[PDB]
Amino acid sequence: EAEKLLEEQRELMKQSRQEAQALIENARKLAEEQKEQIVASARAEAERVKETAKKE
Q1: Which residues have CB under 8 Å from 43's CB, separation 6+?
Q2: Alpha-carbon gap, residue 9 to 55, rounded angstroms
Q3: Residue of 43, 46, 47 whose CA lies nearest to 35
Q4: Whole-angstrom Cα distance, residue 29 to residue 52?
């Protein structure tokens, strides 16, 4: 039973380590996505100041 227990913690740990890498990869990708959005929103803003000044 002890031996079976050790092998079960080992398989679980492996699953955890694999999942952990999956989660980090998703986290950068989402992080990147959010940045893209922020950067895009800032560029909309640059257009907006330019138009208003032209108008003024």
Answers
A1: none
A2: 68
A3: 43
A4: 35
Residues 32 and 50: their CA atoms lie apart, in Å, by 27
CA distances from 31 to 3, 28, 34, 56 (A): 42, 5, 5, 38
Q: What is the DSSP string of the chain?
A: -HHHHHHHHHHHHHHHHHHHHHHHHHHHHHHHHHHHHHHHHHHHHHHHHHHHHHH-
Instruction: Report the C-alpha gap between 40 and 47 in whole angstroms.
Output: 11
Rg (CA), the chain: 24
What does the block give as tokens for 11? 């398989």
